[PDB]
Amino acid sequence: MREVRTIKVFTTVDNINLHTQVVDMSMTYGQQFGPTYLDGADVTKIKPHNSHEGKTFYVLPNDDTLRVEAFEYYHTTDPSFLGRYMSALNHTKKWKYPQVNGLTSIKWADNNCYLATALLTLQQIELKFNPPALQDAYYRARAGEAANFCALILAYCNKTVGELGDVRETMSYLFQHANLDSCKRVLNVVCKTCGQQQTTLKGVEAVMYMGTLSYEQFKKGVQIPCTCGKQATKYLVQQESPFVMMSAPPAQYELKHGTFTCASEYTGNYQCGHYKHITSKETLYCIDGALLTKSSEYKGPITDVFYKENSYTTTIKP
Ligand SMILES: [Zn+2]
């Protein structure tokens, strides 16, 4: 038998389409919308105040219209997506993002070194994301608002804050949401008696290789067993992509200046390690979270190396 007091607020799932709602000041936001967020903070267990008049609240996609709007923006209708994204955003907005040598890094916290390495890599390769939420956060990440982008990365990769991570695993997850269908790779394997056989790779597989860190060795030739037994030679004949990513288990490797875009250093064992990002500019730079180190040459345990590419064709011919 208690009076009703009302204020008008806005609900959204993408912060682009706002939906006017009139709420009762006697019930909580959870009792009317479900899980509700106001500027990242969970406001489910509280009641509307006059200070909420006209503000915009995040909600989970329960309505038919909200599912469509969430699908066009995030490319997913998973109900636990926003939940995991808001939980991650609660940590990433508390992180420090120093501007290390014109790039945006992350101060070490909650084992975020693999995210920092990946975020630095994403700022040095040409890449377009299909989900609008990622592409919007990608540009603001290059500007400086990387807290929102790191939360999306964690949410898309299904990785909770504080857990150890893999840079290559993180990159390949994001590559699925990238427009890489125009990338093309032509490989050629030659055997001494079986003969020669060429295959073509498109999409994500055209920009990743697991076997050697050296882009040059991939062009000169890598030894690969044949179905007949003896050792064959595989070479990269044609490559069309904005970049290539060469990966291998962490081994001591020398990075010569000007021969790559950036690389991933991994120190430690398979159970627990430490990620550092090496980048090549006027000289060799080493970004370790908030720390920076120069040197003319570099020698350390590398696991991923990124190269710039546009169009490469050998003239040898098959
Ligand atoms: Zn053979």
Classify residue 223 by burial, with Cβ atoms within 10 Å: 0-12, 13-18, 19+: exposed
Domain architecture of the chain: domains with CATH: 1-59 (3.10.20.540), 60-183 (1.10.8.1190), 184-318 (2.60.120.1680)
Q: What is the Å distance from ligand 1's center to 201 Cα?
A: 21
CA-to-CA distance for 284 and 52, rounded, in angstroms? 51
Coil/strand/helix, residue 40: coil
Q: What is the Å distance from ligand 1's center to 260 Cα?
A: 33
Q: What is the Å distance from ligand 1's center to 155 Cα?
A: 45
Q: What is the Å distance from ligand 1's center to 229 Cα?
A: 6
- Which residues does 51 contact at the CB level (< 8 Å), separation at least 6? none
CB atoms within 10 A of CB 82: 21
Q: Are 273 and 215 in contact (CB under 8 A)?
A: no
CA-to-CA distance for 138 and 128, rounded, in angstroms? 9
Q: What is the Å distance from ligand 1's center to 188 Cα?
A: 13
Q: What is the Å distance from ligand 1's center to 224 Cα?
A: 10
182: phi then psi, degrees, rounded to nearest 5: -85, 0
| 262 appears as a binding residue in the annotation | no
Resolution rounded to one decimal, in angstroms: 2.8
Q: Are 309 and 241 in contact (CB under 8 A)?
A: yes
264: phi then psi, degrees, rounded to nearest 5: -115, 120
Q: Which two tokens stand for residue 286?
A: 């080493």
Method: X-ray
Coil/strand/helix, residue 30: helix
Classify residue 135 by burial, with Cβ atoms within 10 Å: 0-12, 13-18, 19+: middle
Closest CA to 287 of 161, 128, 50, 108: 108
Specify whether the backbone of 102 is left (phi greater than 0), alpha (psi in -120 to 50) or beta. Answer: left
Bridge partner residues of 293 (DSSP): 286
150: amino acid identity, one letter: C
Task: Please report, to the nearest 10 degrees, the dihedral formed by the alpha carbons of residues 225, 228, 233, 239 taken in order.
Answer: -90
| 194 appears as a binding residue in the annotation | yes
Closest CA to 100 of 301, 277, 302: 277
Show the CA angle centred on residue 176, arms to residues 174 and 180, nearest 5°: 105
| Residues with catalytic function | 113, 274, 288
Cβ-defined contacts of 293-300 (< 8 Å, 24+) = 296/257, 297/254, 297/255, 297/256, 297/257, 298/254, 298/255, 299/252, 299/253, 299/254, 299/255, 300/252, 300/253, 300/255, 300/265, 300/267, 300/276
